[PDB]
Write a structure and sequence with these properties.
3 copies of one chain form a homotrimer.
Chain A lengths: L3 E7 L4 E8 L2 E7 L4 E9 L2 E9 L2 E10 L2 E7 L4 E3 L7
GO molecular function (chain A): carbohydrate binding; metal ion binding
Keywords (chain A): Lectin, Metal-binding, Zinc
Protein name (chain A): Fucose-binding lectin protein
Chain lengths: 90, 89, 89
């Protein structure tokens, strides 16, 4: 049944990121105070969650994308999306 | 199989808001330090996410409600819930 | 069908907590700056959401676990997980 979303925000503007899982694909929409635009994030998943934090003015984002029982962490640390170290078991 | 929830919080008390999508309706439960009560938010949706931020002591909340492939942003900026500018494309 | 997750983080390290609902169980994976490990949280549910806040350096976490139409709040306030006062009505 419906698409699945996850949202985060930071700062005072604020910036907002909304991730949508739709038919096995996760995409990203972004707001930085003027309007919505399509973000760089595009990875497989049926389910998505997100968290973010600032270090000074630098945003760090973690997106957890799940398909079946496999969850992949995707990391934004200022210079592109990369796969993170997250695993669900030892 | 189950309801679906989304939660946010702010401040030091804190205030908490929990949104639940149940049979196509999203409702809101609120905690401001004393007990839980039903919030003003009531809109259609099968899925919900939320984020919030403070500007000084003023809370701003964004709720993303989805039905099928359609996502609607709902905004709280201190004087009622209003539909936001979010579009998926 | 896929597992369903919820995530929160705090501080500057940061600490991260990822909750996964899988086959009626919600479990927790934790990062405190060195590596991922399995957390203490293990409770029933088909759906999970989370929020957290700091009071100074002390973290407070609220996990909302749902099975059918029943949502249970679980609370971390520094000395184990306890059932919270949340009710839906």
């Amino acid at each position: 049944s419906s698409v699945q979303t996850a949202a985060t925000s930071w700062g005072t503007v604020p910036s907002i990121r909304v991730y949508t899982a739709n038919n096995g694909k996760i995409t990203e929409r972004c707001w930085d105070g003027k309007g919505w635009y399509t973000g760089a994030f595009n990875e497989p998943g049926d389910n998505v969650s997100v968290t973010s934090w600032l270090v000074g003015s630098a945003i760090h984002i973690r997106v957890y994308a799940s398909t079946g029982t496999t969850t992949t962490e995707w990391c934004w640390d200022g210079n592109g999306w990369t796969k993170g170290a997250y695993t669900a078991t030892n």
